[PDB]
Every structure is written in structure tokens, then in C-alpha cells.
């Protein structure tokens, strides 16, 4: 194989170190290779046993374990002597040797060795986050799980937290040095990290302490506003979306080609697509609520054709979100896309129920009676545009956390409710046969006694007692116990359970309010990413943008005349980012070393 | 003219709402009324985001209740009264379930039976959900908002009171 | 870009100057309350003929005005003569 033949002799020395590590008994390395089920070249195809510890198969079993779809750029052609007259190729080959010895020291979980190889290499934040996710995922692996593997997994998780702290401190020193150079650092896509930016590496690291740093939040807000400067508020961008032609020479951003490039820089922002998607969903909900409150005629109205083409455009948007998805399991795991599935499905049930017989009034009121369930569902999709607020977001995430404590509150009152309901339907009306009205006598009247309108005059009317004080001179002696079970059901419900929740909600708030802030900031990166991903046209026209995307895909696939240009980073600019990161890496290390000898105990 | 007199008293009602809101200012020299009044003006932002969280629950169950209570009817200002008036007072205690029995046109003994339509009965069920959410989730959440907002900025209310 | 660490250390120096005058007026309240009340109503001639409570208002520091000696000067100005 030409891939194993192209590796030089120091990669054979690292493979000899892997053979010496796998020559130890009860090794997790040989159990990790033995449960990898990959080929000797590195692909998962499910002689070769002798060279099974080569460094390319190690890089493939790291890149399968750390995330999905990584492939590092192992440029092994820089070790030739024909390219040895370059001024910076010795630092590049020291960087490749430090990266493979760093991955060897992460694989043997030797912390001081990996700290020294992380010191002498560059791109320390990205390598520390890949090592932190690699030691996060090595503890959850089945090959590294066993009887005697628990203390090594706990010390290796302590080493994962030790690598998690230091890159957050190095980016804190980068924010203390220069914020603009750190913002130029974090948008630089690494060539050895499969042409991805480091925020995407931080997302695949999935560490919430990295994304709650304010420098990464400033990089996310600068990517939110785009090429436009961030002096505008929400009402200024809303007035610019209301008046495009009267505000775009008046706005401060960045003869007619410069104004066309300023308008193309304005409409490529994700926050403009957020305002356009929120206005399109607000116009949907208002025009759909006006469709529900209007009386349906004998013929098909034009507003039903507008909502049919509108929701067919949302069905094409859901098919674009499913076809260009990042996995089909992640599409189901979004709550809002499942609400969009319930939205499109109940609109097809309501459209087929209205268009089965347009002259019948009974099919019209069955269609409006299911459209009532839809317009309950359509205002529950409007939570999603509350997530970019500073106040609505973590309280909405906290409410979706808080729903489990109401569900166990419902599971605790339910048996009180049905026990006093079967006692009240026994004592209110016995000597009667069993029907659906007996189920109405069990569940309807007790449920609304915990909310305030206990129906005690209605129990006086159903009790058949003709006294002045209302439970006297009754037809039966055994009916009077009604108020007494009420006196107990109401007491328990409005004193115990209702109050308990209050104490549940105080404790649940004071536990996970900061986890709601961190999951709100991770929702922040995801939204920015999703509304950077979404095209700029709103819903009514999104079918014309999907037709233009299908025409561009048909021109790229069949005619093959499509082309695109990408921005290439300069080598001196990336060398300035590398020397800025090396000056901060060293600075943070030294300060930590000054701060580590500044505590009491040492 | 008596009509100009009742228009003038009907705007003077808005004034005499405003004239007792100027009487907070002489509560600021008290040792007890002052920081709690400053804390109430701080606390108004958490009620405004509580109003911004219930509002879409309110208008969604209001457009569902005005759909199911009276369809086959034309659109008017009474349709807006059927969306916003009756749901808003169900979170305060007087749910109008006998009035929904009278507007539901059902002549049963137990009040939602023998109705003119099969599709009207879902009314109590959306209520069973709107009332649950409003008087269990949001109403309670605020309580936890007000405890956390008190325990954050009570000493900033003392310093801004001084 | 490079002014942030000097601005943070200079804000630390602003808090270091904010603590010491509150402690000096605490030592003035520990020495004599009547002489500190005669001190705080004295308008400085080099500070545009203004009293030091107005200088503290233009400083706008809430830790100075939450001291009880300044609150006693404010209550003595409330009751007047
Ligand atoms: C089932 C899942 C999708 C939940 C969605 C709720 C909607 C689509 C369903 C749930 C219960 C359904 C109702 C159940 C019973 C009846 C009575 C029948 O004579 C006419 C249809 C009608 C009035 C149904 C209309 C559609 C309905 C409201
Ligand atoms: C612990 C709590 C949440 C239990 C949940 C309440 C459920 C089980 C009860 C409470 C009130 C009930 C509704 C009250 C009245 C009617 C009208 C009639 O057509 C029978 C069904 C229907 C629509 C009931 C369905 C079931 C119902 C919604
Ligand atoms: C042990 C638990 C259940 C509490 C004990 C309470 C019992 C013993 C009491 C409380 C209130 C009482 C009722 C109050 C009044 C009347 C009306 C009378 O004409 C017949 C007995 C009857 C219906 C009583 C039966 C016993 C009763 C239910
Ligand atoms: C608008 C700002 C100053 C808020 C102050 C509220 C007062 C001044 C305003 C707000 C709404 C107004 C009312 C709106 C509508 C009508 C009906 C009209 O046939 C007579 C006047 C009357 C009854 C108005 C009287 C004045 C009024 C009550
Ligand atoms: C989330 C909450 C605070 C929403 C605010 C409630 C507003 C939108 C609703 C609630 C009750 C409503 C009022 C109820 C009844 C009437 C009488 C009639 O003349 C129509 C207008 C008027 C006066 C409504 C105006 C709008 C109103 C005040
Ligand atoms: C998935 C969510 C919506 C909860 C599911 C609840 C649905 C399936 C249930 C709960 C209560 C049910 C209603 C209770 C009673 C009746 C009266 C009957 O004559 C027609 C059906 C109808 C009107 C039911 C329709 C379906 C219904 C609304
Ligand atoms: Ca280095
Ligand atoms: Ca979607």
C-alpha cells in the first residue's frame, strides 16, 4: 500500500511505541483497536495484523471517536530534502511531529508528556479541545470500560477537565491581548482540521464552558451582525426591513455597484433572515387566524389557496431541511421541526376535510374544529423567535426544563382527582346506570375546583335539597357527605400540592438557572449557524429560491458549468495568528505558573 | 351637552388613575415603602416578560375558543371580543363555565352533553390545558422570578433608596 | 485593542481609590461625629465653592452614600436648624 510506504521512519518509531504500548498485558489500546472493526488502511471495510498500529489507522480511530466526518491533513511530503530550503518548513515538521507525539501521549493518557508536546506545538486551543473531547469520549467507550478501568477512566476524566481549563484560559489571554486579533484568529479555518473554523471544533467538543466565554460570544455577535457594524438596535434593523430603499444609503455599513454590494452585504446577514422568518411566521399566524375566524363559504376561498401555496412552500422548506440535514436523527430530535411536522400534517388533514365536500356545513365545522387544534399548534411555533432575546430565552429553556416537575405534579394529583371524582359521582347520583355522563360526573367537576370555581350552588341544585342553608332537609341522609370530601379534596389540592410546586419551582430555578444560560448560549451558536445556513428569501417566495437552487443544482450536475470562488488566507497573516497564539499560549502558561505558586497550600 | 360631559368624565377617569400614581413620590422618605417601591419598579421588567410569555398562549386559546364557541359567523369587533376578553379573566379565578354552557347551546343536565354539534365539546379540553398552563407554569414561575430578583437586588434597592 | 488591560488595571486603581476615602471618613466618624459633620458641610474654595456631598454625587459612587455618617449628615440637613 502506498499510504503506509509514504510514511517516514519517525512514524515507524511512533508505531514501535504503539507496539510497545500494546505489548503490555490487559491493554486498552489493543482492545480499542480490536473493537474498532476497521481496515488496516483506516477505512471501515470491517500482514495487516503486523502493521495494525500504524499512525493513519490511529488517526482514523481518533477521528471516528471525536466527532463525525473529520480527516486531518497529514502532509508527509514536507519531510523531503527538496523542500528543505524553505524558512518555515522546520517549524511545520516540528508541528507535525509534536502533533503525532501529542496524540500518542493523549492515547497513553500521560498528562505531563501531552502538556509538553502541547507546549512545543502550535494551534493549542484546537488541539486541546480535540484532546478534551477525545478524553471525554474515551471514558464512554466500551473497550475502555471494565472492572479495573474505572480509576484510570476517572483520572483520565480529571485530565480531560485539566485540558478543558487551559484552552479557556489561553483564549482569555487572547481576549486580554487583542480582541480584534482574537476575532481574526477564531474565524481562521485550520487546514489540518478539515478546513473548519474552531467554533465548529468547539461545537463538536460540546463543552459549555468554552461557549459561555464572552470573547466567543462577541465573535458570535459579530457573525450575527455580519459585515454591517453593530451600532443598530432591533428597531433600526426592523425599520430597515420595513423601508429598504429609504434606509440603505442612510445606513453605516462595511457608483451603483457599491450600493448593490452594500445591499448584498445587508441581505446576507443571518439576523436579517431572523427578522424575515419571524415576520413571515407572524404573517402566517395572523392570516391563518383570520382564515379560522372567517366563515367558510360553499366554494373554495382565495385565502385558502394562499395558505395552501404558503404551506406547500413550508413543506418544501421542511423537505429542504430534511434533505440537506446533518443526520436524520438530528432532524427528529429538534422539537420545532416536529411541531412543523404536526403543522403540515394537520393542515393536510384540514385541507382534505374541507375539500372532500365543500358544500356540506358539517364537513366545514369538522374542518374548523380540527383547525382549532392547528391554531393552538401554530402559536406554539412562535417560541423559536423568542430565543434571541436576552430575557425570554433562558426562561423558555427553563420552562421546558420545568415541564417535568409539572408532569410529576399531574402524576401526584391524578389519583386524588379520580378518587374524589368517583366518590362525588357516587354520592351526587347513585341508583343510576353507567354511561359517558358517569365519566363526566367523575372527571369534569372536580378538576375545576382546584382553580377557583368550585360549583357549590350547582351541587346544591344537583343535591335535591330545598333548605335555606343549602345542605338541609335533603331526600337522603347519605348525600350530605358531599361537602365533606370536598372539604378534604380542596384542602389537599390547594394547600399541599399547589403549594409544594412553589417549593419545586424555587429549587429547580436555583439549581439550573446557569445551565439555562449556557444552553441558551449554545442555542445561540446553533441559531446563528442555522440562519446563516437558511437562504435569505422569506416563506411566500421560498419556493422561488428553491426553484433557483434546483436550477443551480441541475446546472451543476447535468450541464456542469457552475463554479465558485473561495477566500484564500495569506501565509503571513496565518503566521501572525500563529505567533500571536504562541505569545499568548506562553503568556497564559507563565501567568498560570505565577498564579499556581500564589495560592496558600503550595 | 351631556355627551361632552360624559366624554370629559370618561377621560377624567384616566386622569384620576394617573393622579394617584404620583402619590408614590411621598412614599420614598419612609424606611419601608421606599426600597420596596424601587424594587417594584425594578420588578416591572419581569412582569413585562411574563406578559410577553403568556400573550401567545392567550391569543392562541382565544382564537381556538372563538372558533369553537361560534363558527359559521362573520368577522366583527365581537369576534375580537370573543378572542381576547373571556380567556384573560380565566387565569384570575372567574372562569365563565356556566356562560360557556349558555353559549354552547347544550341542554343536558351535566352541562356538555346532547349538544347541537359534535365538534363543540372540545371547548372544556383546551380550557383544561390553557388554565393548567397559566395557573401552574407561568403563574408559579413568576414566584420563582420574584424570589430570585429580590435576593439579587435588595441591597441595590437600599443604595438607590439612599 | 491594547488599552483593555491598562483600562482594567486602572479600574482596579479606581476601586483602590474608592475604598480608602470611605475608610478615612469611617475614621472621621470614629474620631468625632460633630467635627465630621462640620467637615462635610464645608465648601472647598478650590472645588468651585461646593460641598463634598455634591462632589460625591458627581462621583456617583453608591458605597460612599451608603455610609451611615453621610446618612447622619443627610438627616441633619433634613431636619435643618
Ligand atoms: C391525533 C393527533 C394528530 C392530534 C391532533 C388532534 C386533531 C387532529 C384530532 C384529535 C381528535 C380529533 C377529533 C375526534 C373526534 C371527532 C368527532 C367526529 O365526528 C368528527 C371529527 C372529530 C371532531 C375529530 C377531529 C380531529 C381531531 C380534533
Ligand atoms: C391531573 C389532570 C391534568 C387530569 C387531566 C384532566 C382530564 C383527564 C379531564 C379534565 C376535564 C375533562 C373534560 C371535561 C369535560 C368534557 C366534555 C365532555 O365532552 C366529556 C369530555 C371532556 C372534554 C373532558 C375530557 C377529559 C378532561 C380534559
Ligand atoms: C375518619 C375521617 C373520615 C374523619 C371523620 C369524620 C366523620 C366521622 C364525620 C365528619 C362529618 C360527618 C357527617 C356530618 C353530618 C351528617 C348529617 C347527619 O344527618 C348524618 C351523618 C352525617 C352525614 C355525618 C357522618 C359522619 C361524618 C362524615
Ligand atoms: C392617548 C394618551 C394621552 C393616553 C391618555 C388616555 C386618554 C386621554 C384617552 C385614551 C383613549 C381615549 C378615548 C378613545 C375613544 C373615545 C370615543 C369617542 O367617541 C369619545 C372619546 C373617547 C372616550 C376617548 C377619550 C380620551 C381617551 C380615554
Ligand atoms: C397578556 C395580557 C396582559 C394581555 C392584555 C389584555 C388586553 C389585550 C385585553 C384583555 C381584556 C380586553 C378588554 C376586554 C373587553 C373589552 C370591552 C370591549 O369594548 C372591547 C374592548 C375591551 C376593553 C378589551 C380591550 C383589550 C383587553 C384589555
Ligand atoms: C394529542 C393531544 C391533543 C391530546 C389528545 C386528546 C384527544 C385525542 C382527545 C381528548 C378529549 C377528546 C374528546 C372527548 C370527547 C369527545 C366527544 C365525542 O362525542 C366526540 C369526540 C370528542 C370531542 C373527543 C375528541 C378527542 C379528544 C379531544
Ligand atoms: Ca507553542
Ligand atoms: Ca424547519
Automatic annotation (TrEMBL), chain A:
Main location: membrane
TM annotation in the entry: 233-251, 271-293, 299-316, 336-355, 370-388, 409-428, 484-505, 536-555
Cysteine pairings via disulfide bonds: 465-474
Subcellular location: Cell membrane
Keyword Transport: yes
UniProt: Mg(2+) 1 binding residues: 118-119, 121
Residues reported in the UniProt entry to bind Ca(2+) 2: 119, 121, 582
Binding site for Mg(2+) 4: 318, 340
Residues binding Ca(2+) 1: 119, 121
Keywords: Calcium, Calcium channel, Calcium transport, Cell membrane, Ion channel, Ion transport, Membrane, Metal-binding, Nucleotide-binding, Transmembrane, Transmembrane helix, Transport
Binding residues for Ca(2+) 4: 337, 340
Annotated residues for binding of Ca(2+) 3: 318, 321, 337, 340
Binding site for Mg(2+) 3: 318, 321, 337, 340
Keyword Ion transport: yes
Family designation: Belongs to the transient receptor (TC 1.A.4) family. LTrpC subfamily. TRPM2 sub-subfamily.
Protein name: Nudt9 protein
Organism this protein belongs to: Salpingoeca rosetta (strain ATCC 50818 / BSB-021)
Portion of the full-length sequence here: 487 to 1134 of 1494
UniProtKB/TrEMBL annotation, chain C:
Localisation: Cell membrane
Domain of life from the UniProt record: Eukaryota
Family, per entry: Belongs to the transient receptor (TC 1.A.4) family. LTrpC subfamily. TRPM2 sub-subfamily.
Name of protein: Nudt9 protein
Source species: Salpingoeca rosetta (strain ATCC 50818 / BSB-021)
